[PDB]
Design a protein around this ligand. Sequence first.
Ligand SMILES: *[C@@H]1O[C@H](CO)[C@@H](O[C@@H]2O[C@H](CO)[C@@H](O)[C@H](O)[C@H]2NC(C)=O)[C@H](O)[C@H]1NC(C)=O
Ligand SMILES: *[C@@H]1O[C@H](CO)[C@@H](O[C@@H]2O[C@H](CO)[C@@H](O)[C@H](O)[C@H]2NC(C)=O)[C@H](O)[C@H]1NC(C)=O
Ligand SMILES: *[C@@H]1O[C@H](CO)[C@@H](O[C@@H]2O[C@H](CO)[C@@H](O)[C@H](O)[C@H]2NC(C)=O)[C@H](O)[C@H]1NC(C)=O
Ligand SMILES: *[C@@H]1O[C@H](CO)[C@@H](O[C@@H]2O[C@H](CO)[C@@H](O)[C@H](O)[C@H]2NC(C)=O)[C@H](O)[C@H]1NC(C)=O
Ligand code: NAG
Ligand code: NAG
Ligand code: NAG
Lengths: 73, 228, 316
Amino acid sequence: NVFQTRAGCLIGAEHVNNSYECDIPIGAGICASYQTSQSIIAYTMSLGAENSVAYSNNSIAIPTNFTISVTTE
Amino acid sequence: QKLIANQFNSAIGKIQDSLSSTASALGKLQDVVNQNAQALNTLVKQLSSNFGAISSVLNDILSRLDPPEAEVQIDRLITGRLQSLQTYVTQQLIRAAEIRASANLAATKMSECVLGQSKRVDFCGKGYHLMSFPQSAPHGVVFLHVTYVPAQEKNFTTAPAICHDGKAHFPREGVFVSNGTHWFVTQRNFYEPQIITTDNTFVSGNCDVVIGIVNNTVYDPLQPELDS
Amino acid sequence: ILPVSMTKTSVDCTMYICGDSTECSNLLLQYGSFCTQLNRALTGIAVEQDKNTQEVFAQVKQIYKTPPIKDFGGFNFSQILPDPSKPSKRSFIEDLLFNKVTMAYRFNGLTVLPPLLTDEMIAQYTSALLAGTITSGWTFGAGAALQIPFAMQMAYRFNGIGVTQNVLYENQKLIANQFNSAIGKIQDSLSSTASALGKLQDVVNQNAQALNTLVKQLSSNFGAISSVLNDILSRLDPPEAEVQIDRLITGRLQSLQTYVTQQLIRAAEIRASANLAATKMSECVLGQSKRVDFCGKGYHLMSFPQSAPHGVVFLH
Ligand SMILES: *[C@@H]1O[C@H](CO)[C@@H](O[C@@H]2O[C@H](CO)[C@@H](O)[C@H](O)[C@H]2NC(C)=O)[C@H](O)[C@H]1NC(C)=O
Ligand SMILES: *[C@@H]1O[C@H](CO)[C@@H](O[C@@H]2O[C@H](CO)[C@@H](O)[C@H](O)[C@H]2NC(C)=O)[C@H](O)[C@H]1NC(C)=O
Ligand SMILES: *[C@@H]1O[C@H](CO)[C@@H](O[C@@H]2O[C@H](CO)[C@@H](O)[C@H](O)[C@H]2NC(C)=O)[C@H](O)[C@H]1NC(C)=O
Ligand SMILES: *[C@@H]1O[C@H](CO)[C@@H](O[C@@H]2O[C@H](CO)[C@@H](O)[C@H](O)[C@H]2NC(C)=O)[C@H](O)[C@H]1NC(C)=O
Ligand SMILES: *[C@@H]1O[C@H](CO)[C@@H](O)[C@H](O)[C@H]1NC(C)=O
Ligand SMILES: *[C@@H]1O[C@H](CO)[C@@H](O)[C@H](O)[C@H]1NC(C)=O
Ligand SMILES: *[C@@H]1O[C@H](CO)[C@@H](O)[C@H](O)[C@H]1NC(C)=O
């Protein structure tokens, strides 16, 4: 099972038109992950999830509540 | 206060479960320890390489040959090993600076983040920063950044200004909002509506210039206080 | 203008040294782990290059996109926002940049690996970062983005620098024109002079520089009778040709460590420059900087990231 990429000739991973988070970085946006039986896949990495802020010149969103997170660095 | 306590205390508890099963979060440290022992290993293996000479054992070249030949061979040993040091050494210098570059980054976080409160954004991690707690780790340091992240939002109609008598009123701190009827001024990073009075707002200009000013009535603390 | 990543290269040590010759290839084994530790070295570079580009550009959890209709109060971002009519969507400015900056080395072994993130992706980040900066203020770096009227954003960014917000809303129209007319000249500043991008241009050159040098080292005798690895094998009986090929190998094998060490040192500079970007990107773009002349001369209001080849460009 062969597929042609931007980064070269890939073998043994079924192409996927869907696009998910980059998991195992390959090259030029192609990122592979294991999950679906199962087979290694290859797909164009989605950079981020998509959002569109709902914006209008009078529209403001002020947080009513908060969290306190402890992030190890 | 109480609600912030549990949010803090629980958020601590998550850390200890993270690191408990997490080998990767220390990858930065684990890599540094590795890469040294790596080049240290490779430095050692280079003692087993011929480098073109007839053997990699120093004496076994000697006792095989009469020394005036060994003087030639031991070159290709020395020329080899001496090089392999300068490779390893020049590595360490480069790698040392890399750590040196991360030491400044730590010694700055230690200074600014721990000992201060960092106005810098995302220097101490995502969210507005409250405090950090350093924790030692082998050949490294681990900060626990306590950061303030807002959560629940509510769409609000807002206005940059409010006419009263034709004067313009602007908030000292925060912004005029309304849920659609009553105009409230509130602080920015938390929703805490308050009725709009002169103590909330200062006067500047008049009603022509501002783009987006909206009619309203700014209540006066003082006026009722008079009426007796 | 800042460099961010440098061209990711990976060299085949056994081939680059010994072309198509087991005779030479066997000798290389007698130097041990040099061949392997070079790949271990260059991979360390090549890996973190896509870590640099990772740290800089993607600090944002989600990809925001500008609203369909642009009313910012008079500020015209069509210059800096993604161009909906280009096949690769990149803001009008970024095209000015990609024009300025610009199997040869692959024949030997120097294979130029593709950067993990395609340029079109880089332009989606710098769209997001720029989409959230415009609509959501600075809050999108601290959590969920919060839509706020852009003109009510700039009232804060004046309070940041100590100018009371009543200045803005009174001067808004004026400030609009000064902004727009300032953006325009950024085009010609880039359009009419090719030396502004020298920082990037220098990085790209020095990389392609050493590669040329590294290649030309193949043609040097290094004391051996010829620079063609086969000629030494063709003319001479091997027992002597062994000593000859050493001077080639010793020469070439050294000549890699020279090149490798340069890349390590040079990458360590980029690694430092990358953090400077990631620092600006976080503090300057995502927040508002109180650090005098860190974001560039003057009191700082906001910054607009723009991608450039193996680099990044901020509009302060
Ligand atoms: C702010 O959010 C916190 C949760 O993060 C809320 O606290 C929870 O409130 C519910 C009641 O609806 C309790 O059952 C939970 O035990 C509380 N959690 C904790 C950790 O104490 C809080 O009520 C929210 N406050 C506002 C004003 O929205
Ligand atoms: C917006 O918020 C204000 C402030 O609470 C609301 O005004 C109050 O609404 C409650 C409704 O339960 C009344 O009992 C109070 O008498 C109101 N007080 C004032 C000063 O108006 C208002 O109803 C809210 N409107 C919306 C659409 O949410
Ligand atoms: C705010 O209120 C003022 C009056 O308090 C409004 O002014 C009126 O504007 C219209 C539009 O031309 C005039 O025909 C009226 O004569 C004005 N009123 C007076 C008393 O002169 C103004 O339009 C309001 N604006 C907003 C945005 O609410
Ligand atoms: C923002 O500026 C661009 C150009 O900098 C404007 O696009 C121009 O629009 C006029 C329409 O009057 C055309 O005649 C020009 O040919 C356009 N130029 C380009 C390069 O597209 C755009 O209209 C401006 N928009 C805002 C909201 O200010
Ligand atoms: C993706 O969809 C196209 C049709 O648009 C199809 O030709 C292609 O085979 C699909 N890819 C995979 C991996 O199924
Ligand atoms: C604010 O309005 C937008 C409009 O699309 C909506 O998606 C969003 O959920 C609203 N905010 C909240 C807190 O529901
Ligand atoms: C805000 O935008 C709307 C368009 O949806 C327009 O009708 C209104 O006049 C604008 N108000 C201001 C203050 O710009």
